[model samples]
Target: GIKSFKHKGLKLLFEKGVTSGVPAQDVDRINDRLQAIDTATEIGELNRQIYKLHPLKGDREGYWSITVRANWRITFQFINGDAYILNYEDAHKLGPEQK
Candidate 1:
């Protein structure tokens, strides 16, 4: 369980939007999810109950993700007391390749 959250690496691009920029319609909900993660005492507390949180499969094993919209997901990793956001992507675009 993570105690806090941070956006860095590629996820930082989405301070406004990542990739080609978050869909204007999705900006509000996405930011709300961001704030929830930021303020939560433990990200695990917001799993399927709050959002469809799940572990990535195959190559993206160590990381986890939460739904932002229909296809958009916020990918991150729990490190110590904080989770570092790695990417913000949807079905149309893949997130940064994680090894």
Candidate 2:
């Protein structure tokens, strides 16, 4: 099962199934994906082509991520066979700003 969320809106969406903070169109997909993660027994089960799952590098090393859309992403850490610190973010805006 999912252990925690880094974003408050995501936590609300997971618990209540609704939120205005994230893209409206992404609600269903996010719900479905989180359900899958919650039920999964192993992290490798999420490494499917459709989800585009992969481990992050650099400062965010040890975290895994999957695409929510062209720019949006869902990131989390796998710990004790559960997911934690889940976050919904705009991939393009991650990390420090460019010069």
Candidate 3:
């Protein structure tokens, strides 16, 4: 299960489906991906062809990410069987971006 979120807004989005700062067009994909992450028992479960799962390198090492859109992804760290510090962001910019 997902244990924590990197941003409060992301938490809200997961729990309540709020799309305040999220890209309008990406909301559905984000929700679907988040649900998949929450139910996954291990990181390996995310390594599917459609999700395009991959690991982050350099300063972001130890984290894994899955595609939500062309440039957006949901990144997380797997710890003790739970997903931690889950984040939704622009993969190229390495953080949230203006919509």
Measured on C-alpha atoms, candidate 1 has an lDDT of: 0.61
Ranking by lDDT: 2, 3, 1
Better of 1 and 2 by lDDT: 2
Clashes of 2: 0
Error of 1 at 91 (Å): 4.7
Q: Which 10 successive residues of model 2 have the least lDDT summed? A: 90-99
Task: Point to the candidate with the largest lDDT.
Answer: 2
What lDDT would each prediction earn against the true structure? 0.61, 0.84, 0.82
- Clash totals for all models, in order? 0, 0, 0
TM-score per model over all chains: 0.64, 0.89, 0.85
lDDT of 2 by residue, 5-91 (tens): 998888999998767867888998898888888887888998878899887877788788888788788989887789999999877
Q: Model 3 Cα displacement at 67 (Å)?
A: 0.5
Candidate 2 clashes between residue pairs 3 or more apart in a chain or in different chains: none
TM-score of 3: 0.85
Name the runs in model 3 displaced over 4 angstroms.
94-99
TM-score: model 2 vs. ground truth: 0.89
